[PDB]
Design an enzyme around this catalytic site. Sequence first.
Site, PDB file in Angstrom:
ATOM      1  N   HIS A   1       0.794  -1.201   0.000  1.00  0.00           N
ATOM      2  CA  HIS A   1       0.000   0.000   0.000  1.00  0.00           C
ATOM      3  C   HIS A   1       0.831   1.257   0.000  1.00  0.00           C
ATOM      4  O   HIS A   1       0.373   2.291  -0.558  1.00  0.00           O
ATOM      5  CB  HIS A   1      -0.946  -0.083   1.211  1.00  0.00           C
TER       6      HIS A   1
ATOM      7  N   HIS B   1      -0.372 -12.442  -2.756  1.00  0.00           N
ATOM      8  CA  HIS B   1      -1.386 -13.355  -2.275  1.00  0.00           C
ATOM      9  C   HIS B   1      -0.885 -14.763  -2.028  1.00  0.00           C
ATOM     10  O   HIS B   1      -1.704 -15.661  -1.684  1.00  0.00           O
ATOM     11  CB  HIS B   1      -2.701 -13.219  -3.109  1.00  0.00           C
TER      12      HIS B   1
HETATM   13  C1  HEM Z   1      -5.688  -6.284  -7.820  1.00  0.00           C
HETATM   14  C2  HEM Z   1      -4.809  -6.053  -6.885  1.00  0.00           C
HETATM   15  C3  HEM Z   1      -5.094  -6.282  -5.521  1.00  0.00           C
HETATM   16  C4  HEM Z   1      -6.310  -6.399  -4.814  1.00  0.00           C
HETATM   17  C5  HEM Z   1      -7.733  -6.083  -5.333  1.00  0.00           C
HETATM   18  C6  HEM Z   1      -5.984  -6.729  -3.506  1.00  0.00           C
HETATM   19  C7  HEM Z   1      -6.874  -6.895  -2.453  1.00  0.00           C
HETATM   20  C8  HEM Z   1      -6.532  -7.225  -1.156  1.00  0.00           C
HETATM   21  C9  HEM Z   1      -7.490  -7.268  -0.048  1.00  0.00           C
HETATM   22  C10 HEM Z   1      -8.991  -6.854  -0.149  1.00  0.00           C
HETATM   23  C11 HEM Z   1      -6.835  -7.706   1.064  1.00  0.00           C
HETATM   24  C12 HEM Z   1      -7.445  -7.929   2.431  1.00  0.00           C
HETATM   25  C13 HEM Z   1      -7.308  -6.792   3.392  1.00  0.00           C
HETATM   26  C14 HEM Z   1      -7.722  -7.295   4.768  1.00  0.00           C
HETATM   27  O1  HEM Z   1      -8.989  -7.525   4.864  1.00  0.00           O
HETATM   28  O2  HEM Z   1      -7.000  -7.429   5.767  1.00  0.00           O
HETATM   29  C15 HEM Z   1      -5.480  -7.965   0.717  1.00  0.00           C
HETATM   30  C16 HEM Z   1      -4.508  -8.545   1.505  1.00  0.00           C
HETATM   31  C17 HEM Z   1      -3.190  -8.655   1.152  1.00  0.00           C
HETATM   32  N1  HEM Z   1      -2.691  -8.326  -0.123  1.00  0.00           N
HETATM   33 FE1  HEM Z   1      -3.626  -7.747  -1.733  1.00  0.00          FE
HETATM   34  N2  HEM Z   1      -4.735  -7.011  -3.360  1.00  0.00           N
HETATM   35  C18 HEM Z   1      -4.090  -6.695  -4.556  1.00  0.00           C
HETATM   36  C19 HEM Z   1      -2.767  -6.703  -4.768  1.00  0.00           C
HETATM   37  C20 HEM Z   1      -1.726  -6.974  -4.000  1.00  0.00           C
HETATM   38  C21 HEM Z   1      -0.270  -6.872  -4.281  1.00  0.00           C
HETATM   39  C22 HEM Z   1       0.303  -6.300  -5.514  1.00  0.00           C
HETATM   40  C23 HEM Z   1       0.409  -7.257  -3.120  1.00  0.00           C
HETATM   41  C24 HEM Z   1       1.876  -7.378  -2.864  1.00  0.00           C
HETATM   42  C25 HEM Z   1       2.764  -7.716  -3.866  1.00  0.00           C
HETATM   43  C26 HEM Z   1      -0.628  -7.612  -2.089  1.00  0.00           C
HETATM   44  C27 HEM Z   1      -0.356  -8.258  -0.971  1.00  0.00           C
HETATM   45  C28 HEM Z   1      -1.329  -8.605  -0.034  1.00  0.00           C
HETATM   46  C29 HEM Z   1      -1.028  -9.242   1.239  1.00  0.00           C
HETATM   47  C30 HEM Z   1       0.313  -9.795   1.671  1.00  0.00           C
HETATM   48  C31 HEM Z   1      -2.220  -9.359   1.918  1.00  0.00           C
HETATM   49  C32 HEM Z   1      -2.423  -9.973   3.235  1.00  0.00           C
HETATM   50  C33 HEM Z   1      -2.547  -9.078   4.489  1.00  0.00           C
HETATM   51  C34 HEM Z   1      -2.465  -9.804   5.821  1.00  0.00           C
HETATM   52  O3  HEM Z   1      -2.023 -11.004   5.919  1.00  0.00           O
HETATM   53  O4  HEM Z   1      -2.876  -9.122   6.845  1.00  0.00           O
HETATM   54  N3  HEM Z   1      -1.887  -7.515  -2.823  1.00  0.00           N
HETATM   55  N4  HEM Z   1      -5.394  -7.711  -0.682  1.00  0.00           N
END
Ligand code: HEM
Lengths: 713, 713
Positions: B77, B244
Site C-alpha cells: 500500500h 497473495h
Molecule cells: C488487484 C490487486 C489487488 C487487490 C484487489 C488486492 C486486495 C486485497 C485485499 C482486499 C486484502 C485484504 C485486506 C484485509 O482484509 O485485511 C489484501 C490482503 C493482502 N494483499 Fe492484496 N490485493 C491486490 C494486490 C496486492 C499486491 C500487488 C500485493 C503485494 C505484492 C498484495 C499483498 C497482499 C497481502 C500480503 C495481503 C495480506 C494481508 C495480511 O495477511 O494481513 N496484494 N489484498
Amino acid sequence: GTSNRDWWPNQLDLSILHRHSSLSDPMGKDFNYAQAFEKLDLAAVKRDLHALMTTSQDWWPADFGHYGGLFIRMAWHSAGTYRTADGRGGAGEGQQRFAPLNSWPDNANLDKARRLLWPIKQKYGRAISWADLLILTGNVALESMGFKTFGFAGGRADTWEPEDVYWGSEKIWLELSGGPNSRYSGDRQLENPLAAVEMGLIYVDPEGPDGNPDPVAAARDIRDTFARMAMNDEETVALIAGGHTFGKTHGAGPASNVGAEPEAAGIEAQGLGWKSAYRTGKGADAITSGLEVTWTTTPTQWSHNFFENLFGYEWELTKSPAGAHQWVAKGADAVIPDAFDPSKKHRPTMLTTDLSLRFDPAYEKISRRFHENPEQFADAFARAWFKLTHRDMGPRARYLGPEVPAEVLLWQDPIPAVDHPLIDAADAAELKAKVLASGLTVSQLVSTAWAAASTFRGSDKRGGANGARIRLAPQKDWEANQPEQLAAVLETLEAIRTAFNGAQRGGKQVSLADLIVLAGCAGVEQAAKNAGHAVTVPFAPGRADASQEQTDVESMAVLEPVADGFRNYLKGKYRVPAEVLLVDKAQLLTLSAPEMTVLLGGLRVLGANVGQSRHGVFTAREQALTNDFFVNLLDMGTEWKPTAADADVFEGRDRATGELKWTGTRVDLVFGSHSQLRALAEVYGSADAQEKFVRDFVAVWNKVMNLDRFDLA
Amino acid sequence: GTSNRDWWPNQLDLSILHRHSSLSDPMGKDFNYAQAFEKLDLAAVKRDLHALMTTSQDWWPADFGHYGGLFIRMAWHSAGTYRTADGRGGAGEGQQRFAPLNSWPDNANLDKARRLLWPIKQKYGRAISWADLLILTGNVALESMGFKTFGFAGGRADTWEPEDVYWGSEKIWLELSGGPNSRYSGDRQLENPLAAVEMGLIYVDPEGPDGNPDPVAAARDIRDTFARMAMNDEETVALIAGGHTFGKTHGAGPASNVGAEPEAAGIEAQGLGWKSAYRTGKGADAITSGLEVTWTTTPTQWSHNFFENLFGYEWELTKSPAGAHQWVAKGADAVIPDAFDPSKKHRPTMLTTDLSLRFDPAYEKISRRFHENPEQFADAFARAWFKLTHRDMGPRARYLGPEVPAEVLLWQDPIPAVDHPLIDAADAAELKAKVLASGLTVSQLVSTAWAAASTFRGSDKRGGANGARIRLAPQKDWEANQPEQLAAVLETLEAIRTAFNGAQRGGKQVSLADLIVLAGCAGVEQAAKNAGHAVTVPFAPGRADASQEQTDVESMAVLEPVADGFRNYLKGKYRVPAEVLLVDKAQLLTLSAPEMTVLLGGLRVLGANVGQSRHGVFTAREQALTNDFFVNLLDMGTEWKPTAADADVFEGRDRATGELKWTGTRVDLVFGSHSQLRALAEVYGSADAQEKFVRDFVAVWNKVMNLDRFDLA
Ligand code: HEM
Ligand code: HEM
Ligand SMILES: [Cl-]
Ligand SMILES: [Cl-]
Ligand code: NA
Ligand code: NA
C-alpha cells in the site's frame, strides 16, 4: 478536488503556524525592512503623495477633485480591523491588500485607492512597505486638507499571504444577527474575539443595528465595538466626527448594479472589483456603501462644520437612491457642494451612526464640548488618529523615522529608558548562583519566568517580560500566574536584587525584569544538571521595570491567558477544544509546530503546570530536563480512556495490568493523536534524541524570553 | 470559522507550493538523511525486524503467529498509491502516516502495522526514516518467509506534512462510479491523473468493478490501474500472485461493527482507528476489508500454492461473514490453516480479482507459465517488488546502503557513468563563447535548455537534463519542444561539442547533456549583457549522455508537457484553468511562488514561448533580461479584455487611446489578478528591482538546471 479539510473538517489546523515561511516571501532571508526604511527619503514620498491628492485618474475620478476623503477612509479601514481580544487585525501587516479583507463589503472601492498608490509604491520599492504607505497616505490626506497630525512612525514590514484570523462563522456577507452562525447571543453580547457587528464590516452597520435606524441603539454597538478596538468614548467621538469632517459616501443608484468583489472578479479586472453597471459606474455615479451622505460644506478642508450641522438641525429619516436609511436636515438650505457639478448643491445629511454622537447621552456631552471647544476636538482627533494607526505596532522601540512623536503615551505600555551599566556575564553567573542558593525550586523559577514572558503576542506586539509587569496589577493577580506562589518568588527575587544593587558601585544595577528572566534561566540550567547534563542557557540583559502608573490595568486585561496549554491551564469551559486554543497560543507566541511541541514537552517535566497538576507530567524525574514526556506519551504499553467524571481528562493505564500510570488532558494527548504532531513527538521520543531535545528546548525557551526585545533588533 | 476557501472556492491555491517549509520540519536546517542512513547498522535493523515478525502483541495479535502478510500489505500500500501521470503518490515520502492516506479504507488496520514498528523506529531514530522502514519491513517479511528479494535501497527522507495531491473529486469514500463526481466517463475511461477505481482504494475493488463479481471485467480494471502505476501484464500477475502467496484477508463479521478511521477517531485512540465492536475486535475476530479469504496452505511461507489452487480447483461465488462477494473452491477438502485455532481448517478461497488472473486470456497465459515454472514466477515477483517499491526514488545515484542491486534496469532511465575528466571553469568560459559565436540566439539557447531541464518532476524524481534525452525519441518530437527548431539547435551544439572534444588532450571531454545546459547558461548571460548587465550564471558539469537503447520510449510518454505555462503552452483545451496547470507545474519543478513568478517573467522576455508567440511578451527588448514583464503587466494605463475569438486570450489596450499594446493568456494575466501573485509581481516591477530580478532569475534558472543532479548531493 476533495481535501483533508473536507473529510475531517474539525481536525486541528496547523497551517496557521507555518504561515510566513521564507518560501512565500520574495525578499531575501537577510532583508531587513527597518534598515531600508531608514534610508527612504520620507519627505520625497510625502511630496509625491501631496501631488497625488489632486491628480484625478479617469478610471476612478476624484470627488471634489481631491482623493483625501477616500484615502482617510482607506487608512481608517486598514487600522479598523484591530481587536484587543487577540491583537489580530490592524494596519501593521498591510493585510488590506489580501483576502479576505481586500474583498470585504465595507472595503468596497478601496481597491481603487490602493491602485492609485501603485505608482508611488513602485517608485520607492522596498524602502516603503504597503503597510506603511497606507497609513502615511492617510496622514498626508489629512495634512493636505488642513489638519495637523500628531506624527507618524514607519516600520510596518509587509507580509506576503493572508493571516489566519477568525472573523466569525457566518457564511453570508453582512448577515444580520440571530442566524445559525450568529455572533450575538443574550442581550446583544458579541462573541469574543470579534469586534464587528456583521461579517465583512469594520465596526458597525451605518444604517443602525441589524438595519434598524435608531441612533440610540446604534450608539450601543459603536461603544462596544470601538472598546473592542481599544478606544474609549472621547476617542470614539473624536474619530467618528473627525473622519466625517471629510469627503462623502457613495450611493448614486441601486446596489444591484455592483458586481463581483475583487477575489471573485474576472482575471481581466486585474485585481479590482465592484465594477458597476450604473451610468458611468464611477465619479458622480459611484456606488460603494449605498448611502449618499456628504457631511460638510467644505468636504476637502478641515472645518468645524460637522458638529455645527449635527446640533444645528433637526433630522428626518429618508432613503438614499439605493434604498439605504440615512438622515436629512429638516428645513435646511442646499449648502453642501456636489462632488462633480458646480451648479448643484445639497442639504446636509447624516448617517444613523453620526446621529448617535448627539442622541446617546454620554456621547452628547463630549460632542457638545467638542462643538464649543474645537481646539479640544482637533487635539483629541489627532491623538486618536495616531493611536488608531499605531495601536498594533508594539513597543516604541520599533517606531522608525523622523516624525515619531516624542510624547510617551500610556497605551504604548511604555518601558523606561535604561540609564546605567548592565550586568555582564560574571554578574549573571553570580546572580544565578544566588538564586539557586535561595531555595527557589526549578518549578518555581521556570513557572515564574514563563508567566512573565508568555504574555507576548505577535499580533500587536504587546506583552512579554520587559517591564516586570508581572509584579504589578493586574498580572500579579491572574489565576494562571498562581498569585500566592508568584508573590513568594517575587519577594525572594526582590531581596536578591536589592542586595546585588546595594553592593555595586558605579551605577550598575539589575532590573527585576531581567532578574525574573535570568532566574528562569537558572532553573532550566539546574534542570539540566538534575538530568546529568551541562547546559548553557543564553541570557540578554537590558530589560527595564515599568511602574504601575505606566501600566493601564484595563488595557492589560486582554492579555490575561484564559487558556495556556503550556501550563495545562483552562480558566473555564469553552466551546473551542483545548488543543485548538493551544495552537492559537502558539501562533500568538510566534512558534512553529516543532517549537510548540518541544516547548510543551519540556515545560511538563519542569513543573510549569498551574496548581502542580500531574496532568501530562509523564516522568518519574520531575524538575529534570529530559525528553520523558515524549518517550512515555508514545509508549504503546499504555492505554488511554476519558474519565467518567470529566471527558476532557484521560487516564493512562498499563495495558497488561490495568494499573493507572498517568493522567492527561486533551492538550497533552493531542501529541499522541494528531498525525502531524505525533510525527514531531516521535522525533523527540527517539533513543537518539535526548541531546536534540535539550538543545531545541533551550533555543525555544530563549526565543520566548526575548520575544519583546525590540531594543536588541 | 469561515475561510477564504469558503468564500472563493475556485480561486487559485498557492499553498501547494509552500509545503515542505523549514517551519514544519523538526530536523535542523543542516540535517542530511543520507549521511545518517549511511551510518545505520542496516543488518541490526533487519535482525530486529526479523524478530518482530513472530512477536505477537495482544492489542493486534498476529495471524498464524506471523506479521509477515500484514507487513507485505503495508509496504505494497505504501508504494501502491503511485500514479505515472504525475509521479505523485508512492512510498518515497512515507505519506502513509499522514492524512488522507492514513485513513483511507483500503489502509484499514495498517495503522496497527505501523504502530508495531514504533519500537524499532524509536531505537534507530533519525538514521532510518519511516519511509525507508515501511519498505524495509516488507522486504524482511518476504525474507523471513523464504523469499529472496532483488535488493533494497535506502534514502527516502521523511516528510512532515501531507502532500496536496488530487485523489479525485468524490465526497464519499468508496463511491461507485457514475455519481455526481464520477472519475469515469465514456466507455469506462478513468480520468487522468487518477490510478484507482474508487476514492480511497489503492487500485481496484476486490469484489469486482463497482462490486459486480465478474473476474473478466475485474481484469480490465486491473490492467488499466496497474498500467497507470507503470506495471505491465507480467509484472501485474507476478505482483498479485506473489502478494497473495501470503497471509489473509479480514472479514469475520459485519462492517457496521467498525468505527471511525484514524483522522476521525477520538483523541484517546492515540492515532489508531477502525476500532471494532465485533467480539474481541482483533485477531480471530478481525475486520479490515470485509472479505474472508486465505489463499494458501502455508500463509507464512513462500510457495507456489497460489497458482496450484487457482488452476487446481473450480470456483463458486459465495459471501463472507460481512456480506462481501468472494469465491470458494467447489468440492475441496479443508486444507487451509486457521489463523488462531490449530484444530480448524478451511477450504481454499479467492477474491474476484484473483480469479482475473485465470479468466482474463492474456493473464491466463502468464499465470500458467508461472504455475509451470515457479522459478520464473519468483524472479518476476522479486523484480517487480523492487520496481514497485523504488519506482519513485529517482536516479540510482540517490540509492543508499549495502543491498542496492547492481543490475541497471531500463525503468530507472539510466545515465551512463562518466569515465573522463570534466571541463573546468576556463573550458566552460571557452564553450559559452563558442556557443554565442555560432549564431545561436538567446531565444534558441534558453528555449532548448528549458526544454531539456524542465521535464524534471519532484514527485518521482524522473526527468531533467541529465542524459541528453531531449535528442532522443520521444522527446525530440514533442510538440512543446518545437521539433524542427530543436533539431537545428542540436546540430549546431553537436558540432561545437565534436570540435571541442577533438581538440582536447587527456581524456577530457564534454557531454552533449552538459553542453545543452551550458549553452542555456550562455544565453542567459548574453541576455543580461543585452540589458547592460554582466553576470555569470553558475554551471556544474558531470551530466552524461544516455542512448536510445537505454531509453524506454513508452515510459517517457508521461513526462511530455501538455501544459507548460513557462512557455505559454497548452497542447489542447482542458477543463482545468491554465493558471491551475501553471501552479501544478511549478510544484512538480519544486518551485516556490516567488521562484515561479521570477522565472516566468524572465522566460517571457527571453523568447522562450513555444512558436514565438507574442502572448505575455510585454517588452520592446526581447532577448534582454529585464523586469519588463512585471512593469508592463502592472501599468494601470493598459486595460485588458478577453478577445471575441478566444475568451482565454486577452488584449491590452491603452486606456485613453484604445491602441493595442499587448496580448496575453490567463497564465500571463493571473500575475496581475491573483492577490498574492500580484504582490510578488509588484516587488519585481518596482523601480529598485532590476538587480534583484536578474539575481533571482539566475538563481532559479540554475536551480532548474540542477534538479536532477543528485550526483552532486
Ligand atoms: C488487484 C490487486 C489487488 C487487490 C484487489 C488486492 C486486495 C486485497 C485485499 C482486499 C486484502 C485484504 C485486506 C484485509 O482484509 O485485511 C489484501 C490482503 C493482502 N494483499 Fe492484496 N490485493 C491486490 C494486490 C496486492 C499486491 C500487488 C500485493 C503485494 C505484492 C498484495 C499483498 C497482499 C497481502 C500480503 C495481503 C495480506 C494481508 C495480511 O495477511 O494481513 N496484494 N489484498
Ligand atoms: C461608527 C463608525 C463609522 C461608520 C459606521 C462609518 C461609515 C462610513 C460609511 C458607510 C462611509 C461611506 C462609504 C462609501 O459609500 O464610500 C464612510 C466614509 C468615510 N468615513 Fe466613516 N464610518 C465610521 C467611522 C469612521 C472613522 C473612525 C473615520 C476616520 C477617522 C472615518 C472616515 C471616513 C471618511 C473620510 C469617509 C469618506 C470617504 C470618501 O470621501 O470617499 N469613518 N464611513
Ligand atoms: Cl492579522
Ligand atoms: Cl505525493
Ligand atoms: Na494585529
Ligand atoms: Na511520488
